[PDB]
Amino acid sequence: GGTIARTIVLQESIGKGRFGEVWRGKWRGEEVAVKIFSSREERSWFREAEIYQTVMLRHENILGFIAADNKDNGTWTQLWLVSDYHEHGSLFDYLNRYTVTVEGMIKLALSTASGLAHLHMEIVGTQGKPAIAHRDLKSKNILVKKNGTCCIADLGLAVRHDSATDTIDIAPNHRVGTKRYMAPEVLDDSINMKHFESFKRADIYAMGLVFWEIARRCSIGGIHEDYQLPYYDLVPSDPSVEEMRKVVCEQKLRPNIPNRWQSCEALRVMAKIMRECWYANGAARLTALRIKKTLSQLSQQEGI
Numbered sequence: 354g355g356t357i358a359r360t361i362v363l364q365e366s367i368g369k370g371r372f373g374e375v376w377r378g379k380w381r382g383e384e385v386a387v388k389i390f391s392s393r394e395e396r397s398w399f400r401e402a403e404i405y406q407t408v409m410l411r412h413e414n415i416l417g418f419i420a421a422d423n424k425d426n427g428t429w430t431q432l433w434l435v436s437d438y439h440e441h442g443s444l445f446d447y448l449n450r451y452t453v454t455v456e457g458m459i460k461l462a463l464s465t466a467s468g469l470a471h472l473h474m475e476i477v478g479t480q481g482k483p484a485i486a487h488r489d490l491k492s493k494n495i496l497v498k499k500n501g502t503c504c505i506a507d508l509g510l511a512v513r514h515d516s517a518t519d520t521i522d523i524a525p526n527h528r529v530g531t532k533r534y535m536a537p538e539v540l541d542d543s544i545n546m547k548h549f550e551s552f553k554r555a556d557i558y559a560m561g562l563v564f565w566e567i568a569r570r571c572s573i574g575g576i577h578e579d580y581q582l583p584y585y586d587l588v589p590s591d592p593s594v595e596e597m598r599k600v601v602c603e604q605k606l607r608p609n610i611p612n613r614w615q616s617c618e619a620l621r622v623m624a625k626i627m628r629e630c631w632y633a634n635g636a637a638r639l640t641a642l643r644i645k646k647t648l649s650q651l652s653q654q655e656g657i
């Protein structure tokens with residue numbers, strides 16, 4: 354028999370994502386995460402397996418993929434994805450549970466930007482990597498490792514670019530992803546989904562929102578903000594496209610940047626990155642690579 358799902362024992366239910374359910378399991382004595390899909394979710398399982406098996410994808414700031422597998426329990430077939438397990442769980446959970454130091458904030462923001470720059474970057478060569486856009490980046494889809502750096506997960510809605518043709522490997526539907534984090538051009542459906550660069554730019558808007566969630570929890574002299582999701586002050590829980598579009602597109606509002614973030618070079622640089630992710634025009638936003646460079650220079654100056 355097989356060497357993966359056959360030998361893994363599920364221990365603890367973690368919860369349901371877009372499709373399937375995540376568990377903590379044990380494999381050769383080691384904790385692993387397992388995402389289990391049913392037979393009628395095969396397209397979702399296959400596509401996420403396909404993205405994670407992309408040549409040259411592995412990176413410290415992308416969730417470490419172990420395998421795709423099947424497991425037949427005697428009644429039905431389960432479709433498995435197996436990954437590294439991170440005890441802290443999501444950035445969303447971590448930021449709810451904890452405050453961070455200036456060092457902690459920069460590590461979380463730099464590691465996220467590094468993972469997104471790696472996803473976005475085409476690597477040339479025989480073992481080349483296509484450019485990839487995420488399409489559902491949010492704090493619930495980022496994990497915090499024991500070393501206090503992040504890695505990006507839920508690659509199931511990702512799209513891959515063929516640079517030679519400027520074409521994408523699937524036919525994208527409109528307004529996939531989490532409505533709270535949707536870029537203005539996604540909410541008003543103006544995005545040109547035939548241009549791969551548009552999907553990169555939409556990811557940058559979402560990463561800006563995630564940076565705002567992190568910076569709220571950066572405690573200096575015991576001062577910090579409470580955990581909130583972006584737009585907690587303007588839209589209902591589980592907002593509709595229309596509710597988001599009225600706020601982000603029509604009223605042109607973004608998450609508030611507290612006066613406190615001007616007091617501190619690290620928070621000033623973070624706030625400036627947020628503003629330069631939040632432009633209505635995607636073409637004006639920072640690249641992940643530029644954000645990585647800026648936070649790398651800030652990491653150096655603060656001695657992390």
Ligand SMILES: Cc1cccc(-c2[nH]c(CNc3ccccc3F)nc2-c2ccc3ncnn3c2)n1
Nearest residue numbers: 368369370375386387388434436438439442493507
């Ligand atoms: C490819 C694969 C295999 C196993 C888990 C995940 C995964 N997919 C998401 C997407 N997000 C998500 C999902 C469900 C419910 C809720 C959510 F936000 N997270 C994780 C994950 C991985 C590792 C880990 N370690 C501790 N938790 N944990 C979670 N991917």
